[PDB]
């Protein structure tokens, strides 16, 4: 019911200004304090911006002067405007709703989180992935089950998201963490185990999405 939806991941260069956006579903921004919390890759959580119902803003010294949080309740929009970005700003940015206080102004604890927006700061350019099928064969079967998947090769930056049959196939899926290639690009694979007997009647399509480059690919995986 209640949730938060955020804008897509992106790549920007050092010194650039960038605006993120977050929207609410089944609740209003006008009666809840909202915040932005970021998580650098492989690191913990850091609160970076907050706004109370009055419209007053709070910032930590780590980003004060560079980040600006704003709100447009009539448009159902929460914004984070970042400026003078640098490598240290690479992180996933969550919008988060402040929780109900127990004392008689934000409580500073968060009862609802968005899915996060992955922002990478780098001097390199974006590159969409190439998707190749991992066809099920006699060398990928066992005890009446078969393994198949897709290979997502040569993209930058992270992340790429992979679903199967537009989200209808989830059981038995394994999407591996990306590996860094010597060229500086990333690669990963996504696999799933299915019944061997139904390979002739069922269809298996892996859906790849790389928002930083606005690339979407749907690859049909058939036996060979």
């Amino acid at each position: 019911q209640v949730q938060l939806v955020q804008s897509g991941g992106a790549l920007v260069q050092p010194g650039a200004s960038l605006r993120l956006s977050c929207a609410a579903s089944e609740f209003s921004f006008s009666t809840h304090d909202m915040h932005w919390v970021r998580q650098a890759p492989g690191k913990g959580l850091e609160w970076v911006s907050g706004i109370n119902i009055h419209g007053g803003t709070y910032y930590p010294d780590s980003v004060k002067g560079r980040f600006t949080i704003s709100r447009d309740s009539a448009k159902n929009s929460l914004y984070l405007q970042m400026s003078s970005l640098r490598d240290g700003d690479t992180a996933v940015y969550f919008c988060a709703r402040g929780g109900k206080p127990i004392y008689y102004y934000p409580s500073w604890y968060f009862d609802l989180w968005g899915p996060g927006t992955p922002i990478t700061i780098s001097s390199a350019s974006t590159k969409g992935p190439s998707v190749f099928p991992l066809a099920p064969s006699s060398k990928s079967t066992s005890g009446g089950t078969a393994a198949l998947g897709c290979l997502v090769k040569d993209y930058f930056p992270e992340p790429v998201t992979v679903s199967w049959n537009s989200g209808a196939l989830t059981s038995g899926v394994h999407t591996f963490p990306a590996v860094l290639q010597s060229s500086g690009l990333y690669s990963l694979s996504s696999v799933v185990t299915v019944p061997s007997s139904s390979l002739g009647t069922q269809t298996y399509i892996c859906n790849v999405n790389h928002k930083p480059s606005n690339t979407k690919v749907d690859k049909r995986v058939e036996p060979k």
């Binding site: 064969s137 060398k139 963490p177």
Partner: protein, 213 residues
């Protein structure tokens, strides 16, 4: 700022056991302390607020205690889906700050991997590259050795590995190994194989194929 410390940084525990992870603040924060749960690829989730108050929808096996500087989160009976990282957060002094997190691993029974191998696709060969993938599915513990052999010749310097996080249902891991060659080098040899060694395998497993079979 207040520094939040959590120790130890990693715990490995058996199903149904009781676990207690600790959090310590560099100064008194009263009971302005909260606990969150996060799994790889997901957003944090609030478990406990103000030291010991319960949250709607959170299983009852979670509980917290502590006042002043020392705090504890307890999971009464550890379940499979409890594999995750747990963070504490102080809200007594501006700015609020999180701890570094404690990662919980489930200790289950040994399980040998299921091994599969995939030849390169004709679409990739048309582009001038050939990737061979070796898949190790659902095993425990995470330690595993994979070796590539081309025409019985042990390879080195041309492969890359990746392991998944712990599965939230069966507490196993999965691993992928990708051998990458050029089309020219790929068509110089005929036999491609990956050899797997694991604690759950009394003898090594070898999956192979012949180019153009």
């Amino acid at each position: 700022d207040v520094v939040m410390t959590q120790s130890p940084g990693f715990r490995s525990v058996t199903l149904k056991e009781k676990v207690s992870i600790t959090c310590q603040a560099s100064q008194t924060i009263g009971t302005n302390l909260h606990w969150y749960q996060q799994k790889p690829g997901q957003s944090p989730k609030l478990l406990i607020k103000y030291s010991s108050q319960s949250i709607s929808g959170v299983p009852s096996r979670f509980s917290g205690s502590g006042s002043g500087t020392d705090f504890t989160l307890t999971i009464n009976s550890l379940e499979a889906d409890d594999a995750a990282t747990y963070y504490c957060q102080q809200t007594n002094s501006f700015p609020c700050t999180f701890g570094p997190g404690t990662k919980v691993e489930i200790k289950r029974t040994v399980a040998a991997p299921s091994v599969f191998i995939f030849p390169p696709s004709d679409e990739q060969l048309k582009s001038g590259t050939a990737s061979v993938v070796c898949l190790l599915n659902n095993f425990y513990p995470r330690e595993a050795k994979v070796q590539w052999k081309v025409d019985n010749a042990l390879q080195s310097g041309n492969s890359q590995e990746s392991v998944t996080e712990q599965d939230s249902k069966d507490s196993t891991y999965s691993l992928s190994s990708t051998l990458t060659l050029s089309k020219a080098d790929y068509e110089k040899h005929k036999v491609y194989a990956c050899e797997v060694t694991h604690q759950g395998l009394s003898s090594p497993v070898t999956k192979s194929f012949n180019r153009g079979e």
